[PDB]
Amino acid sequence: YDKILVLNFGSQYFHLIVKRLNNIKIFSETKDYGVELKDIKDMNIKGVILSGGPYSVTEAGSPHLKKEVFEYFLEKKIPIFGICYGMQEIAVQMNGEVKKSKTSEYGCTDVNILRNDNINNITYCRNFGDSSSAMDLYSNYKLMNETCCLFENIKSDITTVWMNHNDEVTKIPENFYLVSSSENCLICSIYNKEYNIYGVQYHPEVYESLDGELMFYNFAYNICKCKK
């Protein structure tokens, strides 16, 4: 089978990730944060999903992915999908920073999908550093010209997602694209082209996220090239 490895960082919504993969007929394998290389060295892994978690990614004792195992995925060209804590784990893993959000988020939230030609859809640019304009705001970040592959076939440039986080990525990891933002989360979703790394601050596995299943289809089939 074309295995999709789902790593557990303690999420209360963890099994929903397995549900999402079941809905699109995808064989999944569940391991924990401390997964060792010998346990997955001989698996047919096409992609890796890092689940959410209630712990603080900067606090001591919190669940982390072994540097050895993370770099194994990159070297083996295995795409990574980070969710909530999983996204923040990616940032910490690749020279990014994570602080406590000035305004935390919970419940249904609209997220703006970012391209270079749709930044003026951000009508809340002064929420972040009191930026004069949207153009001025995203001059500090790198944006794609085409819609990110993860959001392929999403109708609008706005998606309704389920939020649940007190921390946020404040410094984007090395050479990442900024591909989404919300009113209370500037760096809401990231993308690295050379390593095929995708991160989302919200929970696409929760059914409150209307386009969550579409994202799981894109990552599994279009990005990881899995067979049914």
Residue numbers in the entry: 6 to 233
What does the literature reporting this entry say, word for word?
GMP synthesis proceeds through two steps, the first being the conversion of IMP to xanthine monophosphate (XMP) catalysed by IMP dehydrogenase followed by GMPS (guanosine 5′-monophosphate synthetase; EC 6.3.5.2) converting XMP to GMP4. GMPS is a class-I (trpG-type) amidotransferase in which the catalytic reaction occurs in two physically distant domains, a GATase (glutamine amidotransferase) domain and an ATPPase (ATP pyrophosphatase) domain5. Ammonia generated in the GATase domain attacks the intermediate to generate GMP.
We purified and crystallized PfGMPS, PfGMPS_C89A and PfGATase, and solved their structures by molecular replacement to resolutions of 3.6, 3.15 and 2.6 Å, respectively. Compared with Hs- and EcGMPS, the PfGMPS GATase domain exhibits an extension (119–151) inserted between β5 and β6. This unique insertion lacks even in other Plasmodium GMPS and its role is yet to be determined. PfGATase exhibited leaky glutaminase activity, unlike other GMPS characterized to date1116 but similar to PfGMPS. Although PfGATase alone has very-poor affinity for glutamine, the high specific activity values support (as seen in the structure) that the triad and oxyanion hole are positioned in the conformation required for catalysis and the loop movement occurring upon ligand-binding to ATPPase primarily leads to increase in substrate affinity. Interestingly, when superposing the structures of individual GATase domains (PfGATase, PfGMPS_C89A/Gln, PfGMPS) no conformational differences were observed, inferring that the major determinant for an increased glutamine-affinity in the presence of ATP and XMP should be found in the ATPPase domain close to the interface.
